[PDB]
Amino acid sequence: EFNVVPYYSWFSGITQFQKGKEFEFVEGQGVPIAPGVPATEAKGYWYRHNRRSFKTADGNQLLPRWYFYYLGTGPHAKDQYGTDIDGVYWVASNQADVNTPADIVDRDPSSDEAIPTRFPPGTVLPQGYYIEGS
């Protein structure tokens, strides 16, 4: 959850469940599927949301959840594709030109719900992460 309204992602998140497992995709992979989006526009980044949990008197544990943003949108809309940034993982179809922003409008209000994150057959899924909505 967010105490500052976030940029809304078109897709559900990917939640870490095993610590020590790295968030990664094979180059050319990792752009979630949206109906009718052309492969030339399939370019962007996953953004890590670090979560925090209040102290109790039990065991006293919350793992990061990542959200996808098309290139030129979201909290890292101005950063160059492939630039080394903590918490940002760039992904793009081999059909995409990562020099130009995706021609994709942002999501919300009550106009559209988040698309459950899906990847095409052949996609190497990052071990230790759970895809929300799966």
Ligand X SMILES: O=C1C(Cl)=C(NCCN2CCOCC2)C(=O)c2ncccc21
Question: Who's near 21: CB < 8 A, 6+ residues apart?
Answer: 126, 127, 128, 129
Question: Is residue 9 close enough to count as binding ligand X by CB under 6 A?
Answer: yes
Name the DSSP letter for residue 11.
B
- Give yes or no for residue 2 binding ligand X (CB under 6 A): yes
- We find the least distance from the C-beta atom of residue 7 to ligand X, in angstroms, to be 7
The only residue of 34, 85, 114, 131 in contact with ligand X, by rule CB under 6 A: 114
* Torsion sign over Cα 108, 99, 40, 25: negative
Do residues 44 and 31 make contact, with C-beta atoms less than 8 angstroms apart? yes
**Which residue in 48, 67, 72, 83 binds ligand X (CB under 6 A)?**
67
Tokens of 88: 């940002």
Q: How far is the CB of 12 from ligand X (least distance, A)?
A: 6
Q: Which member of 22, 83, 113, 124 binds ligand X (CB under 6 A)? A: 113
- Helix H, strand E, coil C: the string for 51-66 is CCCCCCCCCCCCCCEE
Q: Which residue's CB is nearer to ligand X, number 40 or number 130?
A: 130
- If one asks whether residue 6 binds ligand X (CB under 6 A), the answer comes out as yes
Instruction: Kindly provide the b/e burial profile for residues 74-96, where b requires at least 16 CB atoms within 10 angstroms of the residue's own CB.
Output: bebeeeebeeeeeebbbbbbeeb
Interface map 11-30 toward ligand X (x if CB under 6 A) = -x------------------
Residues that bind ligand X (CB under 6 A): 1-2, 6, 8-9, 12, 67, 113-114
